[PDB]
From Swiss-Prot, chains A, B:
It comes from Homo sapiens (Human). Changing residue 61 to D/E: Loss of peptidyl-prolyl cis/trans isomerase activity, nuclear localization and cellular function. Keywords: Acetylation, Cell cycle, Cytoplasm, Isomerase, Nucleus, Phosphoprotein, Rotamase. One of its GO terms (cellular component) is ciliary basal body. Coiled coil: none annotated. Residues 42-153 form the PpiC domain. Residues 28-44 are annotated as: Disordered. This is Peptidyl-prolyl cis-trans isomerase NIMA-interacting 1. The modification Phosphoserine is found at residues 61, 98. The modification N6-acetyllysine is found at residue 36. GO terms for biological process: cellular response to hypoxia; negative regulation of amyloid-beta formation; negative regulation of cell motility; negative regulation of ERK1 and ERK2 cascade; negative regulation of protein binding; negative regulation of protein catabolic process; negative regulation of SMAD protein signal transduction; negative regulation of transforming growth factor beta receptor signaling pathway. Changing residue 53 to A: Loss of peptidyl-prolyl cis/trans isomerase activity. No effect on the interaction with IRAK3/IRAK-M. Abolishes IL33-mediated increase of IRAK3/IRAK-M protein levels.
Length: 153, 153
């Protein structure tokens, strides 16, 4: 039981039990399922994303700044903060992506349109295809930087 | 702190702590916020809903059945099951609304379009306007029956 990549975990040095997805890096308190079988993954998905680059990005530059100097660590710090703000309900994905995404797609509020496998960097693709409609990933690491992915279709 | 209608609660006879919204009846393990002030509520929203009627509905009839005979209790049982299935990620709101909503809007996968205050039954409206974009309510009781509301805009 439990959909692809999902496993019950516990925070280190704590008694907090949650569910974590090994493919999307998403964490949630809620059990990810309650049967459907032989479903596989979708052949095509539509996602939006929020990218936070760092000094180690293949191209450490964006519409936000000519030279990204933040470290991988600081980038992750920011990504976790954005995820926290979205999950709290205080800020929505689209407004945060429009303001803070280091990807040009920020102009379209982070929307990347629909795509199939073979287009995006492997970890990005793996996470995108492991998300069910409406789900949001955790921190996804690619050569571009760190992403938060939202599956819209 | 905590947005409109939200309060930290605990399940009776248990140690399970969660957050509950008194206006939308939504329950979640996640703190609903992490500051914005003087925000009020949106003047217009767009929502989708899934209605489960019961024998006490003003009009106990729908495209699903000429006579709804289920009790208020059974209707609530069903609504809670749908909320559970959506939160698990096993089923999405639109497909469930298309199949089980007793409202004609089922034809549009539950979409009601955009609206302002003064159009919908009071409890429905109160819940809709207390939802932030993307949020889903808990069981909302109106004269029509019991609803699950999803704010899309």
């Amino acid at each position: 039981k439990l959909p692809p990549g999902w496993e019950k975990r516990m925070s280190r040095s704590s008694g907090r039990v949650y569910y974590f997805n090994h493919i999307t890096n998403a964490s949630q308190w809620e059990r990810p399922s309650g049967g459907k079988n032989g479903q596989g993954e979708p052949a095509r998905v539509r996602c939006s994303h929020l990218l936070v680059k760092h000094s180690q990005s293949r191209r450490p530059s964006s519409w936000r700044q000519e030279k990204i100097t933040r470290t991988k660590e600081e980038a992750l710090e920011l990504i976790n903060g954005y995820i926290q703000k979205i999950k709290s309900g205080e800020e929505d994905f689209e407004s945060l992506a429009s303001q803070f995404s280091d990807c040009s797609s920020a102009k379209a509020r982070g929307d990347l349109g629909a795509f199939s496998r073979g287009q995006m960097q492997k970890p990005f693709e793996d996470a995108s295809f492991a998300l069910r409609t409406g789900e949001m990933s955790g921190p996804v690491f690619t050569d571009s930087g760190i992403h938060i992915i939202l599956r819209t279709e």
